[PDB]
Enzyme design. Structure first.
Site, PDB file in Angstrom:
ATOM      1  N   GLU A 184      -4.019  -3.628   9.964  1.00 28.20           N
ATOM      2  CA  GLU A 184      -3.245  -4.735   9.385  1.00 28.20           C
ATOM      3  C   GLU A 184      -3.168  -5.868  10.381  1.00 28.20           C
ATOM      4  O   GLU A 184      -2.994  -5.636  11.582  1.00 28.20           O
ATOM      5  CB  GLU A 184      -1.794  -4.342   9.070  1.00 28.20           C
ATOM      6  CG  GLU A 184      -1.580  -3.144   8.152  1.00 28.20           C
ATOM      7  CD  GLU A 184      -0.099  -2.854   7.923  1.00 28.20           C
ATOM      8  OE1 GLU A 184       0.740  -3.578   8.501  1.00 28.20           O
ATOM      9  OE2 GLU A 184       0.227  -1.903   7.173  1.00 28.20           O
ATOM     10  N   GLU A 203       2.099   3.738  10.806  1.00 28.64           N
ATOM     11  CA  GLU A 203       3.022   3.274  11.830  1.00 28.64           C
ATOM     12  C   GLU A 203       4.091   4.296  12.199  1.00 28.64           C
ATOM     13  O   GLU A 203       5.267   4.129  11.827  1.00 28.64           O
ATOM     14  CB  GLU A 203       3.666   1.948  11.428  1.00 28.64           C
ATOM     15  CG  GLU A 203       2.703   0.767  11.453  1.00 28.64           C
ATOM     16  CD  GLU A 203       3.384  -0.565  11.167  1.00 28.64           C
ATOM     17  OE1 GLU A 203       4.629  -0.640  11.191  1.00 28.64           O
ATOM     18  OE2 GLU A 203       2.663  -1.541  10.901  1.00 28.64           O
TER      19      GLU A 203
HETATM   20  O1  LIG Z   1       5.316  -2.697   9.235  1.00 32.66           O
HETATM   21  C1  LIG Z   1       6.250  -2.542  10.297  1.00 32.66           C
HETATM   22  C2  LIG Z   1       5.998  -3.804  11.157  1.00 32.66           C
HETATM   23  O2  LIG Z   1       7.070  -4.269  12.002  1.00 32.66           O
HETATM   24  C3  LIG Z   1       7.289  -3.556  13.224  1.00 32.66           C
HETATM   25  O3  LIG Z   1       8.319  -4.113  14.053  1.00 32.66           O
HETATM   26  C4  LIG Z   1       5.973  -3.353  13.999  1.00 32.66           C
HETATM   27  O4  LIG Z   1       6.118  -3.741  15.343  1.00 32.66           O
HETATM   28  C5  LIG Z   1       4.797  -4.083  13.369  1.00 32.66           C
HETATM   29  O5  LIG Z   1       3.634  -3.628  14.003  1.00 32.66           O
HETATM   30  C6  LIG Z   1       4.652  -3.809  11.873  1.00 32.66           C
HETATM   31  O6  LIG Z   1       3.888  -4.838  11.283  1.00 32.66           O
HETATM   32  O1  LIG Z   2       4.732  -7.593   4.155  1.00 34.30           O
HETATM   33  C1  LIG Z   2       5.876  -6.790   4.440  1.00 34.30           C
HETATM   34  C2  LIG Z   2       5.961  -5.947   5.735  1.00 34.30           C
HETATM   35  O2  LIG Z   2       5.771  -4.522   5.624  1.00 34.30           O
HETATM   36  C3  LIG Z   2       4.424  -4.056   5.482  1.00 34.30           C
HETATM   37  O3  LIG Z   2       4.297  -2.627   5.453  1.00 34.30           O
HETATM   38  C4  LIG Z   2       3.495  -4.694   6.533  1.00 34.30           C
HETATM   39  O4  LIG Z   2       2.729  -3.714   7.187  1.00 34.30           O
HETATM   40  C5  LIG Z   2       4.248  -5.535   7.554  1.00 34.30           C
HETATM   41  O5  LIG Z   2       3.294  -6.253   8.288  1.00 34.30           O
HETATM   42  C6  LIG Z   2       5.202  -6.543   6.915  1.00 34.30           C
HETATM   43  O6  LIG Z   2       6.174  -6.928   7.863  1.00 34.30           O
END
Ligand SMILES: OC[C@H]1O[C@H](O)[C@H](O)[C@@H](O)[C@@H]1O
Ligand SMILES: OC[C@H]1O[C@H](O)[C@H](O)[C@@H](O)[C@@H]1O
Ligand SMILES: OC[C@H]1O[C@H](O)[C@H](O)[C@@H](O)[C@@H]1O
Length: 310
Positions: free
Chosen positions: A250, A134
């Site tokens: 994910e 990400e």
């Molecule tokens: O892991 C970071 C997360 O929150 C963020 O706002 C992203 O938009 C989402 O795609 C992700 O799941």
């Molecule tokens: O589960 C905890 C969070 O961080 C993780 O990296 C996930 O990608 C996201 O989807 C979630 O918001």
């Protein structure tokens, strides 16, 4: 053995969340036990994605050497996963400094992958690399488009053909797919993440500020299904145009959402992804979005079937 065939090997997978991407393994609730991979294979998953915060296991200073003990731990985890006949994805995850100053920490990511690629170079083709999780904030679409090829360049020096997964920028949200510039490398897979609608999937998640209210339903109304279909079609048309396979890296709804809604959302996302030829990995194995209860030793149903399709 094309990128699409390797993508089909990812198939239906699961994320080993809240483990190696915490500051320390176990400090977010999950320590990866060897049997988890046997348990994951047995249920029918094809692959496991393993988030790793390498950046918390390197020297502060150049050449950012990865702790030998951490590296051997990851090696052991990969070994066991592969011995259970899973496809294995290892990434770099939660590199907080990269989000804030990529011009400075970009070369650090390169050095991290220099070292990881070297340690895993003779591993079977069922181990895949994923450069970064990400890209976002200061690591813009443009800088990511500049950074990722340099890491990939470095990886290719020791691993000429291993599958390398490239994340969509802007938190890997579907709508930013067209911003990703592709390289000539034919052994890559593009990955996006799906959490729409965010106020459904992340309702009651204390780590979001402000904490979104609960009681949000997802009902499988025709319009609701169509939202999902349209988002994925957008990813799909881009991918076909560019001849690249897609990995939905994910997807999941937090356990503070009502179960009925979760089952509907999860099964719809899974079906639509399959429809577009996307491989996929549920977030996540056994914590707050989890499918498997470590203590009761049981998969939650029908949610698990919604995630897996079997
Ligand atoms: O892991 C970071 C997360 O929150 C963020 O706002 C992203 O938009 C989402 O795609 C992700 O799941
Ligand atoms: O589960 C905890 C969070 O961080 C993780 O990296 C996930 O990608 C996201 O989807 C979630 O918001
Ligand atoms: O993505 C970051 C956060 O996600 C979830 O809240 C996890 O429970 C927590 O361990 C982590 O701090």
């Amino acid at each position: 053995m094309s990128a699409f065939e390797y993508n089909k090997m990812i198939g239906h997978g699961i994320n080993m969340g809240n483990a190696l991407e915490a500051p320390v393994e176990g400090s977010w609730g999950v320590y990866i036990e060897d049997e988890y991979f046997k348990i994951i294979k047995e249920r029918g998953f094809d692959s496991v994605r393993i988030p790793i915060r390498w950046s918390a296991h390197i020297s502060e200073k150049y050449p950012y050497e990865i702790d030998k003990f951490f590296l051997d731990r990851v090696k052991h985890v990969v070994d066991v996963a592969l011995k259970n006949d899973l496809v294995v994805i290892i990434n770099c995850h939660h590199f907080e400094e990269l989000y804030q100053a990529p011009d400075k920490y970009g070369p650090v990511l390169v050095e991290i992958w220099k070292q990881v690629a070297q340690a895993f170079k003779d591993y079977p083709d069922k181990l895949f690399f994923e450069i970064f999780n990400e890209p976002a904030q200061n690591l813009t679409p443009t800088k990511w488009n500049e950074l990722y090829p340099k890491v990939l360049g470095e990886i290719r020096k020791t691993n000429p053909s291993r599958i390398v997964i490239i994340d969509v920028p802007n938190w890997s949200n579907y709508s930013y797919v067209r911003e990703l510039k592709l390289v000539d490398d034919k052994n890559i897979i593009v990955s996006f993440h799906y959490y729409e609608p965010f106020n459904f999937t992340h309702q009651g998640a204390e780590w979001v500020s402000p904490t979104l209210p609960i009681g949000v339903k997802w009902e499988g109304k025709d319009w609701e299904v169509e939202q999902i279909r349209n988002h994925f079609k957008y990813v799909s048309e881009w991918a076909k145009k560019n001849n690249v396979p897609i990995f939905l890296g994910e997807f999941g709804a937090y356990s503070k959402a009502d179960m009925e809604s979760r089952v509907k959302w999860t099964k719809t996302v899974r079906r639509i992804a399959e429809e577009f030829g996307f491989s996929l990995a549920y977030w996540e194995f056994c914590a707050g979005f989890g499918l498997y209860d470590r203590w009761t030793k049981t998969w939650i149903e029908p949610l698990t079937t919604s995630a897996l399709g079997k």
